[PDB]
């Protein structure tokens, strides 16, 4: 019995089947423009000139409304943030009060970081981000980088996201680290921005969400 | 009464569901003679299991104010649940009587028609829900799916 | 002369926390022997 | 005296002593903080002897000299519920939680009473 929980814990021939990975980090692609399956998982606002603010105002709060709409749990206000650095115009509290007229701004090294810790082990199933090319293509985010880690010493990367044409809510359910979970597992989520659209210098960041699973007398 | 059914409805928001019934029942004593309280008590019974003991409390309510729709709404969500379609159906029937103009109703007795099996009353009450409101017709949609 | 202000007794966390444990099990009793 | 030897856990003594000192004080002077001191001592006194009736009696007199007073209104929470005068509890805990939302004990005295209420 020990022996075997040991080979349990500790697979030696069992596990390695050719020790041949590729080792390239994985790229997704983020365009609107092509309708699939896959991408109309990830994708939610659907695939569409130049749609007026006010109109992307109105599908801003469609997109809320339908990914609140399915049975899910919301703890964007359950965890600690910290960015790279402020700009003492607006924090990230316009970032996560869910309104697309306000905005946080970050303001001084190009390779920005949005810093999120966790008080709790909380499994995240869908990582929600609001982008927006036609309303802030000066401060898009062209290049995006996703962490994962149990704590600031152990962060690690997990996917890229490369931004040509979106304005709308992106939805990103992780898959590749947990099959048999569809969902991921850390305390410690950073996020990167190293460059903008059109050789930019700073990056808003209209929306962002977290997403877990589980008359009257006055 | 009025501070101990805010009370009893912080505790219901919160999961604590034995101390919301604990409020419920003094806001009760404190006036005999209601209805919403007397359906937020028998609320909390059930989330706590004892469904006889609710359904008592609602029959109670509804001798006492024989015309309530709230407490009519609970009576067929409470049949509906327990399996008692047989008067749940007469429930719902004098419901809608009471309002007619609400789609909500429609829909719930279409739904229990389809559940018992009557398509002609089915479709005839979700193709009226269909027609008097779009904003949930998501829903009545597939019921129509189902039902045909 | 400056009289002192007399020392006044204060109703202690533990007696009270000891009565109404006291009370949970008056109430406890009973709860049985109805049933 | 009273005082020292209730702290001593020797009741009987200290309970003569502070009925001396009241009867001494009581014709000259109900106010001035000091008649307030008396009965307020004499009242633990008998809280603790386990008699209640006069203790809720001096308890009584002494709200009527100062209402102002959280530890009284929590007092008067112990010996109702002690007895089965569950609303005058209730009444007198509610007052002392208006006077001082923060009080540790009462919280759980008003959890406790408001339960058996309910169960009565």
Same mark, same amino acid.
């Given at each position: ?89 607006? #924090? ?48 898009? #985010? ?77 | ?148 | ?35 | ?120």
């Amino acid at each position: 019995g020990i022996n075997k929980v040991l080979d349990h814990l500790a697979p030696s021939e069992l596990i390695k089947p050719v020790k041949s990975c590729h080792n390239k980090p994985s790229v997704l692609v983020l365009d609107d423009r092509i309708v699939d399956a896959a991408t109309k998982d990830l994708y939610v606002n659907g695939f569409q000139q130049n749609p007026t603010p006010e109109n992307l105002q109105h599908m801003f709060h469609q997109g809320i409304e339908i990914l609140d709409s399915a049975r899910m749990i919301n703890v964007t206000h359950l965890a600690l943030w910290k960015p790279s650095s402020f700009k003492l115009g607006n #924090p990230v509290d316009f970032a996560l009060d869910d309104n697309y007229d306000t905005f946080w701004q970050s303001d001084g090294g190009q390779p920005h970081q949005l810093d999120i810790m966790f008080s709790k082990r909380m499994d995240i199933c869908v990582m929600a981000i609001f982008f927006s090319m036609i309303a802030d293509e000066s401060y898009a #985010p062209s290049l995006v980088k996703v962490y994962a880690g149990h704590s600031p010493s152990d962060a690690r990367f997990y996917k890229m996201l490369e931004v040509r044409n979106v304005n709308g809510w992106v939805a990103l359910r992780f898959l590749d680290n947990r099959e048999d979970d569809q969902l991921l597992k850390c305390q410690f989520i950073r996020l990167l921005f190293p460059v903008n659209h059109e050789n930019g210098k700073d990056t808003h960041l209209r929306g962002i969400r977290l997403y877990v699973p589980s008359a009257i007398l006055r | 009464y009025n501070a101990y059914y805010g009370l009893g409805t912080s505790a219901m928001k919160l999961g604590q569901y034995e101390e919301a019934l604990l409020y419920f029942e003094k806001a009760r004593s404190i006036n005999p003679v209601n209805v919403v309280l007397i359906c937020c008590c028998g609320g909390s019974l059930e989330k706590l299991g004892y469904k006889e003991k609710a359904l008592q409390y609602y029959e109670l309510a509804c001798h006492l104010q024989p015309t309530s729709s709230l407490s009519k709404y609970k009576m067929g969500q409470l049949l509906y649940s327990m399996t008692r379609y047989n008067v749940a159906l007469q429930t719902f029937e004098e419901l809608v009587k009471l309002v007619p103009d609400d789609a909500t109703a429609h829909y719930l007795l279409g739904q229990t028609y389809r559940i018992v099996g009557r398509k002609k009353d089915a479709i005839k009450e979700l193709t009226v829900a269909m027609n008097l409101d779009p904003k949930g017709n998501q829903v009545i949609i597939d019921e129509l799916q189902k039902c045909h | 002369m400056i009289r002192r202000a007399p020392t006044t007794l204060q109703l202690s966390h533990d007696d009270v926390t000891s009565l109404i444990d006291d009370l949970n099990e008056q109430k406890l009793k009973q709860q049985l022997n109805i049933e | 005296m009273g005082v020292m030897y209730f702290k001593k856990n020797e009741f009987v003594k200290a309970k003569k002593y502070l009925k001396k000192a009241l009867e001494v004080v009581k014709d000259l002077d109900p106010s001035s903080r000091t008649t307030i001191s008396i009965q307020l001592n004499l009242g633990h006194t008998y809280r603790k002897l386990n008699e209640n009736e006069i203790a809720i009696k001096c308890f009584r007199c002494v709200l009527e000299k100062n209402d102002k007073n959280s530890e009284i209104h929590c007092s008067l929470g112990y010996l109702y519920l002690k007895t089965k005068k569950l609303q005058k509890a209730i009444d007198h805990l509610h007052k002392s939680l208006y006077l001082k939302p923060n009080n540790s004990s009462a919280t759980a005295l008003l959890k406790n009473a408001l339960e058996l209420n309910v169960t009565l």
